[PDB]
Design a protein around this nucleic acid. Sequence first.
RNA 1: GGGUCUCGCGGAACCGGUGAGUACACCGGAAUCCAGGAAACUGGAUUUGGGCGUGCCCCCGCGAGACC
Lengths: 222, 215
Amino acid sequence: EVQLVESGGGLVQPGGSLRLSCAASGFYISYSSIHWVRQAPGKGLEWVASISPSSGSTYYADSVKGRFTISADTSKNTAYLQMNSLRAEDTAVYYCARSRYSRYRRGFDYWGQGTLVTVSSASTKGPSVFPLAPSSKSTSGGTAALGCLVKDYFPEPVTVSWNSGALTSGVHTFPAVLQSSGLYSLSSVVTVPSSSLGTQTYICNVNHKPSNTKVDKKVEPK
Amino acid sequence: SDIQMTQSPSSLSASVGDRVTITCRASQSVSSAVAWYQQKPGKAPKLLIYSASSLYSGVPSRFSGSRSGTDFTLTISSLQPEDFATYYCQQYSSSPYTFGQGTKVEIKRTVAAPSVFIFPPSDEQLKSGTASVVCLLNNFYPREAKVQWKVDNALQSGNSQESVTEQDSKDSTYSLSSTLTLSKADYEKHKVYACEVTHQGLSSPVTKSFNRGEC
RNA sequence: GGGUCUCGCGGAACCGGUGAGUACACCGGAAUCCAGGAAACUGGAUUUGGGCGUGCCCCCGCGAGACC
C-alpha cells in the first residue's frame, strides 16, 4: 500500500543548510498534498510546511517563513524541505505526512517514520561498544541478563539489534542520556535463559550511521 | 488568527478496561476538521479519528470521537495495555494546521517488584581509562524507584545517571538502568561495588554487588 | 445546417465512500417536486461533468469573430 520515507537529516552547525527528502510509494503525490511536521525532542507536533503538486501551492508556518522552502519532483514522486539559516530551535525529528482534500478530508492520514535534524556545533563521534557480561555469581531465577554499553557517541541515533535480528524478546534498549561531557551513552540489555549461556552466542549489533561505526560485539561470561 | 487547540488533560493514568476521555477545545470553530492521532514513543503518529467522529480504517472500535461545537472528545472505551501512548488532536480546517499539546496516557497496573542485576566494567573499557558500573532494574511497576550506589559502604553522589524505558506495551512495566562512572584510578582503589534498590514492591531494599575481580 | 483557433455564456446543494490516474467510472446518504399529518417527518416521483488543500484547471454544451 502507501509508504513515506524521509531522508537527509543529520547534524548541522548553526546557520547551516540541510535538504530533506521524502520518498513516496503506493500513491502519486501529484494527486495529494505532502506536509512536513517536526517534533522537537520531548515536545509536541508542529506543522511547518505543505505542498500540493497538482496546484503548485506551498504553505509555511511563520516559524519557518523564508528559511525553509518546500518543493516536489512529481516524476521522482518525492518531496523536499530546504532548510537555511538553521538554529537550535530547529532541532527536531522531521516527519513527512500525506493529506488529501478533494477526494477525502482525513487530516494527515499517513506519516513517515521521521528523520532527526540536530543543530549543534559539536561534531560527529562514533561510540565505544563495551560488553555487559552476565554476572559470574548469579542472576534472577533461571534467567540471566547481559547487555551492551554504547558509550560516547554524537549525535543521536544509534541502532542496537541482537544476534543479527534473531533476538528481540526480552530486549530493553534504554533511551540515550546526554552525559556531562556532551556525548550520549546508552545500554541495551536482554534477559535469556541461563542455560543458553553455554549454547547460544549473544552478539549486539551497533550501528551509528552519522560516523559509519558498525560494531558487532560478542557478549560472553567473564 | 492561528487556531489554537487546547487539549486536556496533560497526562492521566488509568487501568485496563477503563474508559479514558481526552478533550480538545478549538479556539475558533473548526467545523469538524479535527483529527486524533496516537503516537507511541519514538514511532510515527497514527491517525485514529478524522472529521471529529469517523473511525479511520484499521483502528479498533474502542476508539471514538465526538464534537459539541468547538469541544472535541476522544474516548477509549476499554483501555488496553497497548494503548499506552501520547494522543493528539489536530484541526485541519485551515493552515497553519495546529495540534493539541498532547496527552500522555499511562497504564496503571498492579505493583511489580524489580529484578536487579549489576554489571562490572569490561576489561576492554578499563583499558580506555574509564570504568562504567551498570545496575539494571527490570520489569517493575510503578515507575518511582530509588537506586543508590555504594563503593566500600561509601555512598556515591553526582557520578551516576539513570535512564528509564517507556512503559511496556504488553505488561505495562518499566525498566531502569543506573550507570556509575569512575576513573580507572578510582575504580581500582575499592573492592565492593553495590547497587541498592528501593521500590514499592520490595518489602526491604535489595542490594546487588560484586567484588572487583571476579572471573 | 460542417471542420479548426480565439473570445463570450453556461453545465442543482450538502455529506460520505469505492475502483482508476488524470481531470474518468461508480455506490450511498441526501435534496427537489407532489400528496398527507400538529409534527422531528411519511409516502410517491425525480434529481446535479470532473481534477486538485480551493481558485484555478480539464472536459462538455451554446453563442460571436477570424481561418478553411
